[PDB]
Amino acid sequence: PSFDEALQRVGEFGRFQRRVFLLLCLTGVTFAFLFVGVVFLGTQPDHYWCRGPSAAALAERCGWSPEEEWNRTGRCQRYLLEAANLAAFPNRSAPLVPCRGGWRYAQAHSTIVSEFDLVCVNAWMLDLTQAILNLGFLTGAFTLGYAADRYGRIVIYLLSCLGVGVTGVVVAFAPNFPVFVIFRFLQGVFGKGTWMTCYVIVTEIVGSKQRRIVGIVIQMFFTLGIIILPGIAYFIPNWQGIQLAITLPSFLFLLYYWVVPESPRWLITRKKGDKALQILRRIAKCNGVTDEEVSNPSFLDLVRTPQMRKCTLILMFAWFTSAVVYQGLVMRLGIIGGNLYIDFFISGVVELPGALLILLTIERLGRRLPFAASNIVAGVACLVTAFLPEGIAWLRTTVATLGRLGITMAFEIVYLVNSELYPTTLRNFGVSLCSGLCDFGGIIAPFLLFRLAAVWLELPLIIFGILASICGGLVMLLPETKGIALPETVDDVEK
């Protein structure tokens, strides 16, 4: 309780904590860049085709542009002039033959598809990048939680920032596909640590009050990164340029070092004490206990107390359900506006009003009610999209978008309440352990969607709606985490 009085004497919001807030929100923006920017990596080429050695030789000796070459001849099989022994075919009597390799591309924009030749039979492994990135997210969460709890928050934050920067530079200059995949897996490993660590530190540094502003505003910065990603993607077209621009700000964030102290409350576990008091004194620019050391956290110790176990299980299931429901709704949406950049910009922009509603609502009504309402709205939208007369009304897309907004609002509220729920020691371990489960949902979603859609078109939507509708009990079983600051050690289970 003296720590609460310590923050009362100096803290809450000052100039220092505001500057730290903006500085870490920058890292949130960069993590948002990393999480989605693959959709602008390897955008599908307008035309792709394969040519034989004779066709390539004659094309080079005549020097025509790829556009007319594709026009006269994307297809995965090509005619062969070798069998024949300005049109090459007089009457297309030459048979067509499938090609194992040698295909080229026509569009001038640079994509990972052009460099790594991910088309035809290799078009399978374009989503392999998705799976590997999400698996890297999962494993990086799982291990970096323990890494950041064993050491301090700031050291692991800085190390993860350096790792993200260097692995991104390596990926930008990957010579072959296996190197690209391995180092992008590693980038996903390190990328998960930065976001979780920055969220936990910015939650710890502020007191019990105005913590909801902290969480919701950093989520708004994540959404801002999503919104602004089309800007850089459109302005600089080259793949290498886009990845370089995404990854270099990690070094600038690595420049922090002495700017941001790790956490007073992290060190108040009688690990250091004197360093904590020094940090508090350094905080107080404007104005002039003892317990058993948890030390290394244990995964089994993460689930040992019935209330602790209940919180862990409900949080994990909510994460997984949100992931699968969001994937289903996004697949249902398709394309809006006829443009990729415009669609992405609109999708990002419409995310903000939900965040504003959350920011204005959490204090008055708590946190359980808006979260339950968001999940219920998502489930009802899923069911309504499933059952309606053949989609003869323009309300399919509106209902799907409304459900997506509801599930994103739930995604934002859960990421905060997850942070408050866990103890101080287990905080960065328990958090990102559930994000591991949402990453697992992300990897498993396409297979489940295809399998269920094989049986019936609207079965996945029905299942997702039921999963979302379970929230009525799922989140009602939570303790509302209102005005109780952040629980210390095993005092999480008092409620």
Numbering used by the authors: 2 to 74, 88 to 99, 114 to 316, 328 to 534
Paper quotes:
Organic cation transporters (OCTs) facilitate the translocation of catecholamines, drugs and xenobiotics across the plasma membrane in various tissues throughout the human body. Organic cation transporter 3 (OCT3, SLC22A3) was identified as a corticosterone-sensitive catecholamine transporter in 1998 and belongs to the SLC22 family of the major facilitator superfamily (MFS) of transporters. OCT3 plays a key role in low-affinity, high-capacity uptake of monoamines in most tissues including heart, brain and liver.
We purified and reconstituted OCT3 into nanodiscs (MSP1D1 filled with brain polar lipids) and subjected the sample to extensive cryo-EM data collection and image processing. We obtained a 3D reconstruction of OCT3 (apo-state) at 3.2 Å resolution and completed the model by combining the experimentally determined structure with an in silico model generated by AlphaFold (detailed in Materials and Methods). The outward-open state of the lipid-reconstituted OCT3 is surrounded by several lipid densities. The protein structure features a V-shaped lateral opening at the interface between the two halves of the protein (“V-site”). Several conserved lipid densities are present at this site, indicating the margins of the lipid bilayer. We presently cannot unambiguously assign the identity of the lipids in this region (brain polar lipids, which include cholesterol and phospholipids, were used for nanodisc reconstitution). OCT3 shows an obvious access path to the substrate binding site that is wide open to the extracellular side.
